[PDB]
Amino acid sequence: TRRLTGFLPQEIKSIDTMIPLLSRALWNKHQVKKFNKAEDFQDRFIDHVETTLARSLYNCDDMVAYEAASMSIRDNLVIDWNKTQQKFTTRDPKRVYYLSLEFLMGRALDNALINMKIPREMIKGALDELGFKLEDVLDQEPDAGLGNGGLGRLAACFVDSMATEGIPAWGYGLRYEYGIFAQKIIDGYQVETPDYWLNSGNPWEIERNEVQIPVTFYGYVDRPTTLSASQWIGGERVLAVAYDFPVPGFKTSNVNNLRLWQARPTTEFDLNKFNNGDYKNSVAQQQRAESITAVLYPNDNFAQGKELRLKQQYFWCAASLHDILRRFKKSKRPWTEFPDQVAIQLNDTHPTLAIVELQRVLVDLEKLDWHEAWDIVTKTFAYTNHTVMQEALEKWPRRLFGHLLPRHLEIIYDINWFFLEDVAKKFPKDVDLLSRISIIEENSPERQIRMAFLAIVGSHKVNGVVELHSELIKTTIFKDFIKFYGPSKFVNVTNGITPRRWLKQANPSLAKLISETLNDPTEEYLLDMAKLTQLEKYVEDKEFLKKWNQVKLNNKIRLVDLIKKENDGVDIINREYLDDTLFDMQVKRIHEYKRQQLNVFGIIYRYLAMKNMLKNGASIEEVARKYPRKVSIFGGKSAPGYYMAKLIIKLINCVADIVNNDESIEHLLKVVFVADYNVSKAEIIIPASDLSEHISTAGTEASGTSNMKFVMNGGLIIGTVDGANVEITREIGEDNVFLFGNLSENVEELRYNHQYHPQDLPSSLDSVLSYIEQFSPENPNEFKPLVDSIKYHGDYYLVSDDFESYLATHELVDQEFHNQRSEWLKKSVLSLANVGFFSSDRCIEEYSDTIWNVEPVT
Amino acid sequence: TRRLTGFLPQEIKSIDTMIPLLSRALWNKHQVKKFNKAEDFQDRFIDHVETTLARSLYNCDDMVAYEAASMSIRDNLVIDWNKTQQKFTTRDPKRVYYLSLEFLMGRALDNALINMKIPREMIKGALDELGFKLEDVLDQEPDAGLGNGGLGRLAACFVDSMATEGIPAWGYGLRYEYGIFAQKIIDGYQVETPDYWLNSGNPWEIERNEVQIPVTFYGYVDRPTTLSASQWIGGERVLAVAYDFPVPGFKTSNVNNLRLWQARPTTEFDLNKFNNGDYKNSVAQQQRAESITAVLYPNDNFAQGKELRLKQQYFWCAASLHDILRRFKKSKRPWTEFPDQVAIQLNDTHPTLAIVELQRVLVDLEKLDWHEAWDIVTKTFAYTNHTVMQEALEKWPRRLFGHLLPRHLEIIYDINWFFLEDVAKKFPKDVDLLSRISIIEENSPERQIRMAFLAIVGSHKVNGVVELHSELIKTTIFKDFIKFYGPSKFVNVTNGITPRRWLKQANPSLAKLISETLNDPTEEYLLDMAKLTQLEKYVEDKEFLKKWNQVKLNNKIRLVDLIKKENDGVDIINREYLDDTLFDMQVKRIHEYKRQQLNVFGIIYRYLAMKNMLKNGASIEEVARKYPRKVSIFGGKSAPGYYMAKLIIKLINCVADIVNNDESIEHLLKVVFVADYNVSKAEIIIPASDLSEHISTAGTEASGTSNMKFVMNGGLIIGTVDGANVEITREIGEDNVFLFGNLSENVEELRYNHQYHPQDLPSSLDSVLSYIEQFSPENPNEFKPLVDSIKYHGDYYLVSDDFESYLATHELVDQEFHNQRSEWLKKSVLSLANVGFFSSDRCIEEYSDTIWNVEPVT
């Protein structure tokens, strides 16, 4: 009884003898086996329809089929999830715990079908014989509302690669009920909605009602000097109940685990209250508890949200560390071996409280010496940093932090004290250094606790996400920490993406082409991306290029089908002429620095130029020869209160309404916006891409994984020389990317000249800003804040500066693609051929060998 | 696609031809079959552990096993739920819809094991081979928090019988999240707690996320004379989502359905609000919606609750009628045939709005003539009335009703108008009749709508729950209605209980005995309870009686085991001597008229008598000879604000603390209170019963089904000549029940004399009232209101009057049981032998033949 993920070997050798031989024989002659053949899947599927779902052939529809098929696949997974967890218990290897505030998991079923050792075609077969089109049942699955942007997607890809590599890793996070939110574009505006992804339960979790951790907030420390084992007599306690998500690996039978926490009240219902008619309060406790896992990134733009964000980050750090030390004590190993057995990765600053908490439990509960405990903490953590600009670094104010977490404030003051002593002993008399490098920021009037500095001081390794970013954190925001610790502590591991979701799941038709040309029927190239350089040989010969183009044309058709479906059966994109239609997409977070507005100003410019040309008596054959057939695809969500980002979404929608419906330019240009862009939409959108925009102001992006997703699928980049664009260029060659705009050196000066020595706007740009001051007749000055930020508030994101360069590169793109497609297709094949360094398997190799010092146990 | 419970035959003959023969062959070669053998169940079970629950042999504990096994059985059920629903669709028989505000379903697994055509033993076998004790896994199941008292349990039993009989019936109700509440006795007090029965989901439902009915509140009617099709432009809309619970029948493969509604907001999350930091309001709608199915019987003792109760009753009437007319229209039959096809039973007044609603939809939406519609309404409904005292008849105030339901007020005024005309034409010049029989009560200052009168006027049949009740409603509260309608309309169908839960589930050991003795290996007697009269032959012979008693002893052990478990391993009841311990239980709603206080006053009396006896130098052999070993088992819940009922629970607990721990009486008396008495507890508690108390003031109980449950299990009744006691007595014979106390004739006079001509309290009673004015040292006047109600406020429930009679009958009981158990055992065997009329199968036969005019379609 009692232990769900592994019996220590000894326990099993004792227990086994007290079980009567008949029980052991029966259990053994009826133990579940994994599917070995399609019939096996059919039998599980039909039994779940008839028994679980209490349904029959006559009313098992596609939602039923998905529920049943998911239940069958999870059954198979559980068998290997149990074996793997027992192997690690029996073999006690060093383990990796990956703490991330968001895991952008996407949809689980097809990924399980691909990472299945004995196949999508067998299951595909089996389902079709029972009456089901796999693709129709695949669509019934809601994307897990467990993450949001690239931070979470990086945690997701990693989790996959660790499982493929048999690395003993677990991810810990939160089980958000409602996602971050979900986007509807109502009347050209974004309206936020609850992302109801658990409405019909969730067939992939294991709810572990058995694992319930208590977590405490507020209270007081009573000793009756901080260094000593103190007692936190807290004021509120909530419960963390775990939910296990199994994680398959490609070709392994090693299934690793994601453990997410849901917050529950200590007292569900209060009958006293209800019976006295105080109904609202009888359920009050329940309400408070559930706030903590209700929504991702709760609005912290006011005290209550600042509090809830901290409250949530403590709850997950607390419960996860608890579960991480519980498992350790089954080893019965001495605390001094904890660093040799546990590696915890802080994916960004959000889990830094885990440092302060391990110190808190080792000193207050476990009674170690403050200094012996701190040595263990130090050797256990490592921090990945994703921030460029110092302003985005997380700080908490002392009043709030103290009130909510009294003992953890005490330990942060202690930690900082000894660190600042160590600094004083290394740089005698350097007064200002002590102020700058301190964890507590002495500010007016609220002192802050600088979390990123606490994370450097508590970790044995910090790393950036791309080489240039890494150089930059040693050179800029963490310079003093490099002086005191030495360059050694600051590493780089360039980000990457998983081949199985982003190439084999998202683009099967290309995955088959490669397995055909390179003659690799076992898809071994997904484990060894290095082999894709062989595609370079076949760059020179025609039938291959025809083949390569066809894949991309069929992929374009899928996207077109999606836009039609999403437009209630009406097509937006003109399907005839599609092979000569350049699909140009910019799908990412709507934010002024991502410069979606630069891209829109470029669209309006081209449109204005086309229209003017027609009216000056050119035939469309003449206009089309200069501005050929294009579809601009935009997708992404704005934060709920970012007014300017929400304006940019309305503006894209307005441009689309005038241009898409303007007969005169006869379908030479269309603008489309995809709502509630999530991973599944990105799996349809990315393999269809002819060109993808990666145009942020230079110097603003640290890495950038969707860039890599476009490259792995033969898409070309038009981008700024920033972020992941720089490393893409290194690997695939400068001659294959379309770079433009200013470089970072010139950014601070061009910014200065804008205010204290202004030049003027280019006529091109001035034509579009006057033309929107597009048309918007109902409110002919709605788009004014945007125009006036460029035209009157120093144009901080350099739209004016890059406008002409951007347009010049687009003239290039257009001629390349339409008029000399064999040159275009060579850029695409070579992209593929050299994308392999960005495989998240290589990121996990690097992390395992330099930071975690972890070996696979498979 | 789309229809979940049956394809009209035609639809299938058409569809079938379009399915390719290979799909049809595959589907057909992999269609789930029902378990035919234990291996079949093992395979489903292991697969659910490994796959659904992602677990393994090494960590599949009992919660896991239950979850898995439940899932396997539901799977089997679903196969026949689907067949049955399709048969009815194909055969279009008249259907019965049973509307009930509460369905006390209890725990579903074992019931399913028993009502399983090919067995608990096969499953049992199978589980044990895998490592599981059935009984350990059975306990993991929370009792469905879907009902509360007998009203709901009547609906539950019915549902079972209809299913066994192949009667085409569906039950409609609400899916309460939190039950009514759950009771913890903290410090001897009841503390209400949320009944968290859905904490780990619910493996028996089918969540039909597909069936979502809108329901509307407030608003206005706009015509721009009520008679006409009017438009209700309501002000709030909530959603009703169905959850299907399959309902097996014994030996049938006919599985019928319970459809429960959950209220959902029309808008789950409001991102606008959230983003503005108005977090609280962003989720506000959700909050309001969920109020409607959050809790059963919401506290209506203030406007807000009056409102919520009406709100809830409308929601369920509305959604259910909707679902009932929807299914009707698949028949494509004329509205004039609705009465020939739908029979809707109003289980009590709570669904009377269904009348007004069917009239509302037939007139406003379906556009029938007010008078033609009304004729259909009339012929469709029948009302079972469960109320004795007119005061408990539901009325709603016009302001509130009107405000919440404006159109339904209009129709109620109309309905009433014509009815009152009809009355005037039948009784010219009878002025006051018109006032009395009216549906709208002209009162100060708020006019009420008398729901029960509306229900009479809208039904074609009204029925009481027991013959005497029935006569009484014709004679009293509904007399004028009998004058005007004629006796014919007022029927009786005495209530009853299902044999399979209350005998075979709750008491297997007896069910085996009967199958052994009557040589009926097939348990056919559960279908034909009439055969149990054969047990009467075996009344006379010893081995049988030994056998009969053994059963009851083992059953008592079970209860004891329960109380121990519930007392943290500490036993309360002394296990040695158990066969001579009379288990005397009164498990029911704590209410002054149920007279638990009479029973407690009787316990304290006996204790005071015992103690006094000991102190007067009797040896316990002497005390024991007079007051033999008894365990009073109390169980039941008080309403949250019923101060006096809550006092009574403290008082029972106080008594138990003094008596149970009083060494002196050496275990001759124990008082035990079982907290949070639900059905499962009642399935352990009832077969263990030696005697059960049914002691309400005479004239206060309409029927009373636990009484029958006790009878079916050989328990004897001590009761008032009231309620179901009267019919129990008829059937099993007066000589087998212990009746006492005043008769109803005498109640009004005894009551009068209490105030305007008082006699004095019996000394017996005065001893106990002074003794509690038991001990309670901390607050030596806590129990005063109880004492002063009897002693100074006319003792309206006749405790004083019946005290002595009660004690006298107890003396009888005690002697019968301890000293002449063969006579006791004959009462028990004969009880059994003649309990058969109270089989809910016979209730359902009667209902089917007189009221519903329904035939089985099996």
Ligand SMILES: *Cc1c(COP(=O)(O)O)cnc(C)c1O
């Ligand atoms: C790839 C991915 C991301 C990360 O992309 P960024 O370049 O970091 O914007 C975000 N969202 C989705 C849905 C993705 O698939």
Ligand SMILES: *Cc1c(COP(=O)(O)O)cnc(C)c1O
């Ligand atoms: C039988 C039953 C009831 C109905 O009994 P009443 O005699 O009407 O009090 C109520 N609750 C439970 C748990 C039951 O099993």
